[PDB]
Symmetry: C4
């Protein structure tokens, strides 16, 4: 399989790269605004009740639909990563350079953070919820959950969008990528929160001023995404 490529500053500062960074910022902002917004909407409707099944459905569907769109609207400009773990898994398989990937991370983190401060305002100052592992459940269980579900996501990105042999999968790729996240929130929501996405988790941690447990949402997703890049890149593109 293709090796890691560090890239160059010239390449990573080209106008095409700059457009890509803006696209990643915008896609991540819009994804996180909707997705976090659905969780705040549930809190508003229920006066801050514990999550129930209708709420889980609302939040999962919102994230799946919004991520489909966020990926689609960047696909021809940046590739529509919307997610540091996607960028990382792609970098592991030589699909994006390291330098460009770092700038994608910055754009994604900025976009997510912006979305969360916008939410705080437009909702009239409601709390921005953070991802956390369920009460009582171990952190390793949470990490392993996040490894598995993020592996699923990044593997999907490889199979439908990166693979040169994708064929007609390329047309439906944004939808597959969004709806694997939706599906996986329906499973993982009550356990890890169903992040799959360090930026999605980071914005709220900034806006709520609370990084307790936040490491889970870097370690788990990066390992899952990296494992997907290693497996798909070496076996199915190698």
């Amino acid at each position: 399989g293709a090796g890691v490529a560090f890239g160059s500053f010239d390449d990573s500062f080209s106008l095409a790269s700059l457009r890509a960074y803006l696209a990643e910022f915008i896609s991540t902002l819009l994804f996180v605004f909707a997705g976090v917004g659905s969780a705040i909407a549930y809190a508003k409707l229920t006066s801050d009740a514990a999550l129930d099944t209708p709420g889980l459905v609302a939040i999962a569907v919102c994230h799946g639909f919004a991520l489909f769109v966020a990926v689609a609207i960047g696909a021809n400009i940046s590739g529509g990563h919307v997610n540091p773990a996607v960028t990382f898994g792609l970098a592991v398989g030589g699909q994006i350079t390291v330098i460009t990937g770092v700038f994608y991370w910055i754009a994604q983190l900025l976009g997510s953070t912006a979305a969360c401060f916008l939410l705080k305002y437009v909702t009239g100052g409601l709390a921005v919820p953070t991802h956390s592992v369920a009460a009582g459940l171990g952190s390793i269980e949470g990490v392993v959950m996040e490894i598995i579900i993020t592996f699923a996501l990044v593997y999907t990105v490889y199979a439908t969008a990166a693979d040169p042999k994708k064929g007609s999968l390329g047309t439906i790729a944004p939808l597959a990528i969004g709806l694997i996240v939706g599906a996986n929130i329906l499973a993982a929501g009550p356990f890890s929160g169903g992040s799959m996405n360090p930026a999605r988790s980071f914005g709220p941690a900034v806006a709520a001023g609370d990084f307790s447990g936040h490491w889970v949402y870097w370690v788990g997703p990066l390992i899952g995404g990296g494992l997907a890049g290693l497996i798909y890149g070496n076996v199915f593109m190698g």
Copy 2:
């Protein structure tokens, strides 16, 4: 990026333009009939309860599915705007002429209004609900919410349907456009109502004889749509 184009009467009165106006009328009627209808259905089932999470899901899914369809069924005739803010954002980027755009607005407003009078009849005279900003929440918060979510919609229309480089996105564009509205209602419903669409809001205001607060659903969506046209048109098509 392309400038605003005023157009001509000859062009805007051509048979092709007249077909486009009828298509916009029909698509907007069917979109608003379903979407408002889902809100009246919730009121019927619950005896006019406050919105809850099942209801929000029902209404969001209905709007997302219905808008997907309404866009698809006009895509090859009018472009499937279904929305004055989409038309406006496209006009800002030179994608539709101003004169033609004004006639699209008329067709959309007429279609929405018609849908709402039809609903009043077929439901046995139930109230046609109007979009309003949540009790206690400021109007600027509501406007800014609508700016953000309408920006998302119009940006999606640009990226998937207008951009000449859309490629395979063009096939899934109607679905992206519908499901961003669905996603954004799941976030915004309990705050602004999740309009994104001055015509969707206007029909009910006419049918309920209540324009209180209605300005929000012109100012917010037009600004969001205009900002999407400015950004995408000048950066990603320029």
Copy 3:
């Protein structure tokens, strides 16, 4: 626009036509089995409660997904009508011959009826629910509801599947056709039941031995479907 074509017996008894009839039987059986089945599932889970919002969502989503599939799996064999009103609207615009269309009706009615007797068995003898206009609501209101929502469906079939200029819409047509039915059930369920489909309504009327009010689900859908054929066929294909 194209006129009505009566067709011929030779044509309507060809092997291609016979395959089409079997495909319509199978698609309609599978559509109605799922869709009615979701309503029986709700009754089982709730001990025959009145419809609530979760139930409406379940039933609407089931029908939208199932109809998408039923249309897709016949699209290249029969055209995937799955619905006497679709067949009728297509016949009005010269898209299927009258003789072939009558045999499609028979196949659809048989498939729906079969599904409903299968359901009665596999559910352990539970009642097969019938479409009815809501208590107190007038029959004309119910008919007009069904006209509007069936117009939407058949117009969608024309715009995405019949029109020679459909282009990329043809790829997503089955999904548009399914999800307009889903959307429209979210609106119409508590009022007319959201049929759009004389066969979908007829199977249960046979299996429950109850044709009270059943005429609504022929008059409303046939008029809507016929109006869609007249408008689209003469304006947008003429």
Copy 4:
């Protein structure tokens, strides 16, 4: 129609075949992890309540989305069967060799079982639920339910993915295949559980150490899948 083909060891041990087996393992693992996971999520949220309508929706949507993805991500490597009954129905119509098909079964069963042991861990040791026929309902009713719904699935796979004349259906095939399972769970969940898939059922039986009634989920799905292969393969591909 094409006959059954036994195949060869050389063919079934080729690198292409080995890649296919890994893809089937991964797709089935990810499908079952999400889908079973959604059922465990419901149990967590509700403290092990009986299934209700929100829960049925959550579980059906999760399975439909996850299966769409699992099929898509194997489509160009293995064909994306994810299901012994799909493999069997395809084998009946000569679309996969018997030897290769047996190895697909092994990969699918292993993947499902792995998913279920992973779930047991990451959820903090919660019970892995098994498919069972509803209390009081006969086993033949359960089998016949599973025949019908699995026929639907495998017929969909033939019509959209196997048929050489699939045309544009091939692009949307993964989505049709996923959403027929979603639809059919909305009908069958409270009666048979809505399996359609011997591997999906088998993983939990292993992880819960409970094979009571499990035969239903081999007999019903294999017969349905085999009947779909016989009908579609001989009539619509013959």
